[PDB]
């Protein structure tokens, strides 16, 4: 199964809240590449520790640009990019 | 230039209103193929006179399925599919 790429939880100390993202925001693209579902967001974020990514986001009928500075979480094999959203 | 695929006008006697579409609806896909912008909607509708097409549409945060029965308008070279929306 797959889910729409809509934010339902935010880490108050994480990158997504710092970037101005909000519950209910729907991610449309990351660095110009459409995101088809939430798992695509997870996979792309995890692969990009420490990287700035450019989002297009839909919020209440308006398409917005958002710059998101991914953090780093985990150790060894598990070290991954982190956005602070679910 | 391009525009998001959002309905801003509807023919009260046309297929889109009959299908249950509403101002502000955002078309996401036609027959499972993403629509990137409004011109893609125009081109796909015009090419499909008389055809039923399956839409995914975003309305106020909810993804909806909509079956749209395209009509026919125009004569000769200009004969085209018609959805009744702008
Ligand atoms: C998006 C995913 C990788 C994770 N839930 C995070 O906050 O980064
Ligand atoms: C979508 C386009 C082809 C036209 N405005 C129509 O109503 O069909
Ligand atoms: Na969606
Ligand atoms: Na950020
Ligand atoms: Na990954
Ligand atoms: Na929206
Ligand atoms: Na941006
Ligand atoms: Na859009
Ligand atoms: Na119809
Ligand atoms: Na066409
Ligand atoms: Na919406
Ligand atoms: Na449908």
UniProtKB/Swiss-Prot annotation, chains A, B:
Highest taxon of the lineage: Bacteria
Compartments it resides in: Cell inner membrane
Location of the PDZ domain: 3-72
Leader peptide range in chain numbering: none
Assigned protein family: Belongs to the peptidase M50B family.
Protein name: Putative zinc metalloprotease PA3649
Naturally occurring in which organism (per UniProt): Pseudomonas aeruginosa (strain ATCC 15692 / DSM 22644 / CIP 104116 / JCM 14847 / LMG 12228 / 1C / PRS 101 / PAO1)
Record lineage: Bacteria, Pseudomonadati, Pseudomonadota, Gammaproteobacteria, Pseudomonadales
